[PDB]
Amino acid sequence: GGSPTSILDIRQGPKEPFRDYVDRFYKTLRAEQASQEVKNWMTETLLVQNANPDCKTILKALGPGATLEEMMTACQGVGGPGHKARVLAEAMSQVTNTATIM
Amino acid sequence: GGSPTSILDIRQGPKEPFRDYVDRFYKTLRAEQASQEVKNWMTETLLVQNANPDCKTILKALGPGATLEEMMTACQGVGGPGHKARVLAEAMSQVTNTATIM
Amino acid sequence: GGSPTSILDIRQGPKEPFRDYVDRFYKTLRAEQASQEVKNWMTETLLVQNANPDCKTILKALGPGATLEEMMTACQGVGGPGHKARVLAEAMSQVTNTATIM
Amino acid sequence: GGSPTSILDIRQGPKEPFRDYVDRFYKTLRAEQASQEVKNWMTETLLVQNANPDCKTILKALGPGATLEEMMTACQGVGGPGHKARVLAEAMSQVTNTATIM
Amino acid sequence: GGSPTSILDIRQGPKEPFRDYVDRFYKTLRAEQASQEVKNWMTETLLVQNANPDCKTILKALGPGATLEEMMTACQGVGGPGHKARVLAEAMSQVTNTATIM
Amino acid sequence: GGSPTSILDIRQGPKEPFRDYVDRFYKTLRAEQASQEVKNWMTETLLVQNANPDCKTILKALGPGATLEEMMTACQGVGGPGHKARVLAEAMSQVTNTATIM
Numbered sequence: 001g002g003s004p005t006s007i008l009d010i011r012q013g014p015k016e017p018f019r020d021y022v023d024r025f026y027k028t029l030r031a032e033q034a035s036q037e038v039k040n041w042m043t044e045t046l047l048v049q050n051a052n053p054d055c056k057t058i059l060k061a062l063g064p065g066a067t068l069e070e071m072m073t074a075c076q077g078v079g080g081p082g083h084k085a086r087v088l089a090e091a092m093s094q095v096t097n098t099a100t101i102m
Numbered sequence: 103g104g105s106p107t108s109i110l111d112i113r114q115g116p117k118e119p120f121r122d123y124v125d126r127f128y129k130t131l132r133a134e135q136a137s138q139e140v141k142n143w144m145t146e147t148l149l150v151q152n153a154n155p156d157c158k159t160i161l162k163a164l165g166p167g168a169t170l171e172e173m174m175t176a177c178q179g180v181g182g183p184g185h186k187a188r189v190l191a192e193a194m195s196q197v198t199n200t201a202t203i204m
Numbered sequence: 205g206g207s208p209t210s211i212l213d214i215r216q217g218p219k220e221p222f223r224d225y226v227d228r229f230y231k232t233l234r235a236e237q238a239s240q241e242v243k244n245w246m247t248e249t250l251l252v253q254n255a256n257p258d259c260k261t262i263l264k265a266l267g268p269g270a271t272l273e274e275m276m277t278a279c280q281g282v283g284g285p286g287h288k289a290r291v292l293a294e295a296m297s298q299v300t301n302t303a304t305i306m
Numbered sequence: 307g308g309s310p311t312s313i314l315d316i317r318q319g320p321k322e323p324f325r326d327y328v329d330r331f332y333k334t335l336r337a338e339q340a341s342q343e344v345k346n347w348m349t350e351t352l353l354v355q356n357a358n359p360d361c362k363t364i365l366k367a368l369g370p371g372a373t374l375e376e377m378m379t380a381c382q383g384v385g386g387p388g389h390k391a392r393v394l395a396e397a398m399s400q401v402t403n404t405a406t407i408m
Numbered sequence: 409g410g411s412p413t414s415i416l417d418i419r420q421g422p423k424e425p426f427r428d429y430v431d432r433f434y435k436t437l438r439a440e441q442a443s444q445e446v447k448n449w450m451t452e453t454l455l456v457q458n459a460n461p462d463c464k465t466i467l468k469a470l471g472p473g474a475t476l477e478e479m480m481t482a483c484q485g486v487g488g489p490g491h492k493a494r495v496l497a498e499a500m501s502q503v504t505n506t507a508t509i510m
Numbered sequence: 511g512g513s514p515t516s517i518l519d520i521r522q523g524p525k526e527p528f529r530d531y532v533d534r535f536y537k538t539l540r541a542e543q544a545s546q547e548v549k550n551w552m553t554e555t556l557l558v559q560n561a562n563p564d565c566k567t568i569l570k571a572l573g574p575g576a577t578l579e580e581m582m583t584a585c586q587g588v589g590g591p592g593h594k595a596r597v598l599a600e601a602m603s604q605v606t607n608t609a610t611i612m
């Protein structure tokens with residue numbers, strides 16, 4: 001499901017922010033020789049799924065229609081204390097209130 | 103919204119400290135050819151809004167129109183045991199008293 | 205057996221991402237002059253096992269059938285806020301309820 | 307209030323240890339063209355104030371009159387488990403007992 | 409007894425992977441001139457004792473009489489979420505239930 | 511409290527391992543023109559106190575009679591889970607039980 005260099009073998013490091021992830025997302029796409037429309041929805045589906053579950057959760061959180069920028073800001077912070085500062089608090093409240101998960 | 107290398111793109115990384123983000127910001131603002139008043143407010147609107155939810159929200163935390171010193175000290179602590187530490191024990195207290203959020 | 209430079213000796217770094225470790229494994233694997241199928245069943249048997257208990261455990265966790273992509277998506281979650289948030293989330297309440305372990 | 311390269315613009319990176327930040331301060335101070343006395347008092351009034359709220363709170367904590375060595379010893383520990391750990395332990399207990407803050 | 413570089417000094421960077429440390433042990437062991445066997449038992453007695461108190465601890469948990477491989481399977485989990493996660497949960501529940509220690 | 515480059519000015523980075531620090535110090539000590547004996551009297555008191563509050567305290571923690579074997583063997587874990595697993599496992603029991611400190 002994606003050969004080396006192909007935008008399909010492109011993924012946001014588990015810790016890689018969206019801002020860092022995104023840059024290369026398209027650099028490796030440019031490596032892929034696909035029409036814009038071919039790469040377009042790829043630019044979309046490959047980006048988000050391969051965008052590190054912290055971001056995917058955010059991206060999905062931003063609700064569809066999100067802009068590469070909107071997701072970018074929310075999932076950009078993914079990586080440094082910018083986002084993590086908050087996630088430690090929420091992850092913490094993810095267990096305190098939501099400890100029971102079914 | 104925001105072209106590459108523009109002060110608009112300029113986004114304090116999450117971990118990106120204010121003194122750091124702020125340093126490349128203005129170096130970058132210098133790079134975008136804008137009028138004085140244009141850079142004058144970009145220096146503002148792009149510095150606080152795209153200032154990494156930690157620093158950014160800090161500026162807003164300090165209170166709007168915050169003196170560069172107020173956002174600087176407050177955000178110049180972003181990335182160190184000075185501020186980062188505050189986030190570890192404090193967010194921890196956001197879930198202690200403020201865990202119930204609606 | 206499984207001395208250095210062998211896909212056997214190929215163990216995802218403790219923190220080496222499935223995206224990297226897979227590359228390492230697949231880089232040291234190619235370096236390993238094994239039959240194609242041999243590499244493939246190593247890719248199947250060695251990978252899952254010598255893949256960093258975080259990814260490794262996941263591999264088994266996704267349940268058999270995990271395409272290289274499934275173990276990839278699941279083991280790609282591992283390494284940052286995406287998954288770490290969760291590991292922290294469970295290791296925390298596993299201790300709370302599941303503290304009693306026999 | 308403080309131009310670039312001036313000791314006024316000199317600020318201990320949040321994580322920047324005092325040992326590193328002191329060098330950058332004085333190295334930069336050398337760069338700043340201020341009388342020996344003017345540099346000497348910057349060395350005092352600037353070094354402390356722009357010394358990373360962590361080392362900065364340590365300087366005051368050591369108590370005014372702290373010899374550069376005193377702030378150095380205490381503010382040198384800033385940046386690693388040396389100080390960061392102590393902070394984790396103190397901040398940790400600052401929320402346990404001191405959580406109520408007015 | 410045991411000066412720098414001599415395997416005796418050979419120690420796992422506490423965060424250093426067992427695999428790397430071990431490589432350092434063995435890479436440097438080769439550097440420490442001994443009888444074939446002498447280097448080997450060092451490989452045993454020194455490695456466990458000087459391999460990151462966590463791995464040092466794992467090894468004992470790996471079963472006195474641990475093979476270099478077994479500990480390799482476990483200590484490899486060190487330096488990674490494999491262990492960072494596990495330690496977090498255990499230290500977490502040990503203090504909670506086992507808080508009273510005598 | 512020690513001139514630059516002198517073994518007196520030799521200080522284990524707050525994160526600097528004792529292994530690295532012990533090595534920095536001894537090289538620096540050789541650089542430090544302390545008599546053959548003075549270096550030995552330096553290698554003793556300086557090495558213990560300037561070696562990063564984490565080790566430094568450990569050195570005292572090992573209790574008097576701590577030979578390089580004790581401080582190196584303890585302060586070795588400094589930097590990662592070896593020494594630190596204790597910092598995180600015990601801190602948990604240092605604040606929970608010992609939070610009240612007078």
Ligand SMILES: O=P(O)(O)O[C@H]1[C@H](OP(=O)(O)O)[C@@H](OP(=O)(O)O)[C@H](OP(=O)(O)O)[C@@H](OP(=O)(O)O)[C@H]1OP(=O)(O)O
Nearest residue numbers: 015079080117219283284321385386387423487492525589
């Ligand atoms: O110990 P690791 O699992 O390898 O985590 C490290 C560790 O961070 P923590 O303070 O959270 O433990 C580093 O700090 P030190 O071990 O050197 O103290 C830190 O880097 P800084 O020193 O610059 O704060 C770095 O975080 P990062 O590089 O993201 O800023 C992070 O590594 P990972 O999160 O990538 O595992």
